[PDB]
């Protein structure tokens, strides 16, 4: 199926407490694989997945140098934005960026993206065409105009179509045992009493990879998406994921409700009941 390479970048100022904190975290699909954190003792780009042991020392040196340069660029950017928004030097502010690319099963580009936010709100983004930008406010419009005269979209497009795609293919090759695997969910239902002669039924799905999964509850063949409570799919500490979804049903009628689990590792979806 399709696969992605994404980098999540954050710069956070802290006036009165030194330089901003700067972090970069890389993912292939749902799997964290590299990280840089300025608050570490000796800041360096570091592997976060076992398969990244396959890169040589030059990889780490080059990525570290790039991250240090980026850290300095974002420190300047925090100052620049104080000017654009007419803000004081005493408050903390945050810049966030998501950058990456997605390829199909055949390794060819499906889409590329780059989106920025300031203090948790949209700032500037690359359009799907990979040629133009969209700016959320007048400050971002200043950035847009700078980037247009510097030929930035051409540079970014070259990265998205070239480097990003080529390295993603390499990571998928090197990390195939991890990245191309399927770990099937194991499911179970728990039961909890409530006041008013009702019961909560909670369907759990554990130990699965990749992260995409669907959990539903049904009654008489119809899904109960409206009445369901759930949590977002979440990582479980070892590279697998988990999720739960619950419904409140009348006491004594639990046997009429079924949980359904759909996943890449389930040739036939699971059907369970309390």
């Amino acid at each position: 199926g399709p696969h992605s390479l994404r980098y999540f970048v954050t710069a956070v100022s802290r006036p009165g407490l030194g330089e901003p904190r700067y972090m970069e975290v890389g993912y292939v699909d749902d799997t964290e694989f590299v990280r840089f954190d300025s608050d570490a003792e000796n800041p360096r780009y570091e592997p976060r997945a076992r398969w990244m042991e396959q890169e040589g020392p030059e990889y780490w040196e080059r990525e570290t140098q790039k991250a240090k340069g980026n850290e300095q660029s974002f420190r300047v950017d925090l100052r620049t934005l104080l000017g654009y928004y007419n803000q004081s030097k005493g408050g903390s502010h945050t810049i966030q960026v998501i950058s990456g690319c997605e390829v199909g099963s055949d390794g060819r580009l499906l889409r590329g993206y780059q989106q920025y936010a300031y203090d948790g709100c949209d700032y500037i983004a690359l359009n799907e065409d990979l040629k133009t930008w969209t700016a959320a406010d007048m400050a971002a419009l200043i950035t847009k105009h700078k980037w247009e005269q510097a030929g930035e979209a051409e540079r970014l497009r070259a990265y998205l179509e070239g480097t990003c795609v080529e390295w993603l293919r390499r990571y998928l090759k090197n990390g195939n045992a991890t990245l191309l695997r399927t770990d099937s969910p194991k499911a179970h239902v728990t039961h909890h009493s409530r006041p008013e002669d009702k019961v909560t039924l909670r369907c759990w799905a554990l130990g699965f990879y990749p992260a995409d999964i669907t959990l539903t509850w049904q009654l008489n063949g119809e899904e109960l998406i409206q009445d369901m409570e759930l949590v977002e799919t979440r990582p479980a500490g070892d590279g697998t994921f988990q999720k739960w979804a619950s419904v409140v049903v009348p006491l004594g009628k639990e046997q009429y409700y079924t949980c359904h689990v759909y996943h890449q590792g389930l040739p036939e979806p699971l059907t369970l009941r309390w």
Binding site: E63, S99, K146, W147, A150
Partner: peptide, 8 residues
């Protein structure tokens, strides 16, 4: 491999 970001 990550990108070398452009200043704002």
């Amino acid at each position: 491999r990550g990108y070398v970001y452009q200043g704002l």
